[PDB]
């Protein structure tokens, strides 16, 4: 898992899957652009990376 | 009735498959290539059978 503030990180570049996070509350699709926090992901399709 | 159902009739080597193939290759040409393509005739089209 791409660390917190590391060269790899979702709280910057987006999550490791489609519309999901790191930690694991927001899943599949529903939350289109839901600006999360605990994992830290603006829930978008990972291709942002 | 679907694309996937046809994915079995193709792999099964069912006879009707090759039937359609003859009328698909009918009026549908091909590109044929040899390296090095030093000029332009290195590629030409030939209506296959």
């Amino acid at each position: 898992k791409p660390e917190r503030d590391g060269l790899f990180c979702a709280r910057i570049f987006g999550p490791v899957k489609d519309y999901e996070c790191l930690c694991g509350k927001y899943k599949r699709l529903k939350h289109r652009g839901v600006i999360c926090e605990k994992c830290g992901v603006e829930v978008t399709q990972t291709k942002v990376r | 009735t679907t694309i996937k159902a046809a994915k079995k009739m193709v792999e099964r080597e069912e006879a009707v498959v090759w039937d359609i193939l003859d009328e698909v290759i009918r009026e549908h040409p091909v590109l044929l290539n040899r390296a090095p393509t030093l000029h332009r005739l290195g590629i030409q089209a030939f209506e296959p059978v």
Partner: protein, 75 residues
């Protein structure tokens, strides 16, 4: 047109506008049905666009004037 298209090239004129006069015509007879004029000898919509040029028919002058016809029939 399977062997040699020499008659239908110089009708429109050149070989590049044997494409965009036949591409446009190969498009029209693939989507919304459209008429097969010169006997559909089995064949497919590929040859047909060109085959209409081999019997004194399809041209750029006949594809930009008859598209005004389908803009005088839907009122």
């Amino acid at each position: 047109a399977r062997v040699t298209v020499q008659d239908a090239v110089e009708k429109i004129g050149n070989r590049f506008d044997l494409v965009l006069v036949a591409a446009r015509r190969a498009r029209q007879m693939q989507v919304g049905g459209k008429d097969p004029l010169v006997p559909e000898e089995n064949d497919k919509t590929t040859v047909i666009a060109l085959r209409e040029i081999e019997e004194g028919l399809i041209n750029n002058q006949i594809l930009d004037v008859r598209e005004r016809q389908e803009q005088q029939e839907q009122e």
